[PDB]
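re the bet — no i am not wrong, look at it urself. input seq straight from the record:
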Amino acid sequence: GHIYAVGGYDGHTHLNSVEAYDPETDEWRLVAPLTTPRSGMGVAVLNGHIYAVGGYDGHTHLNSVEAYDPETDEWRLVAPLTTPRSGMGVAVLNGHIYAVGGYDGHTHLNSVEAYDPETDEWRLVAPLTTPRSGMGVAVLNGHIYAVGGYDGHTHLNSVEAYDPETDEWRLVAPLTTPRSGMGVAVLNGHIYAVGGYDGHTHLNSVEAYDPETDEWRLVAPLTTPRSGMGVAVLNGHIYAVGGYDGHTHLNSVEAYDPETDEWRLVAPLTTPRSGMGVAVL
């Protein structure tokens, strides 16, 4: 029951290191590193393992995928993506991992692929309504939401949702502001879009979506602007991990309580990290 901060960029180097947070002690420790440096990857938890999907190793945008076992503290590569992808969103739904959009080293992608651990294979599914990289992906009410991002020319406020039963995407209500490089969490049946970049400014604002009314509203802002952060939900709180404040890559970490609508800093990472993946396991 810990938060893992996977890879990322420390301000000078793309990282293969991985660290884990225990809320009960408010402490981070390094664990086994990735097989390859990875930033801008997606991170999913499925079958008790953490999957680190694609990203950028400092020279190449990756199609490789690797999985972590906490019980042995080891990573192993699994089947690669159909295409290199960095800046994608990763969701877990119906026992599959979805890799949504991203950038293949040349083009921002509208394609979406899904992984099955039982057969260790990827297949493409229905593509997004628009290319999107640097988006946030949430799973709520059995649907996947692709929030914001960048279409290759503009930072987006649009949001779309996927139904696996029909293999169809549809647009839903847009964000209050364009946002790319944001973090997206699900808590209390709401989707939170945390921070990011609006096309001109790195943002400390945070908004939340209600599916029952198809509306967004702003909530309490972060203590600092953050883009390229990781967001986790643990113990009924949202954690915003690292990122970039517009000038510096951050090792700070803050946590949000919906019941009081307030953020507070917690223990910082061992290293500054932006474009990391964050998982709870």
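see?? Residues 3-239+269-280 form a domain with the Neuraminidase fold (CATH 2.120.10.80). told u. also The radius of gyration is 17 Å. so pay up
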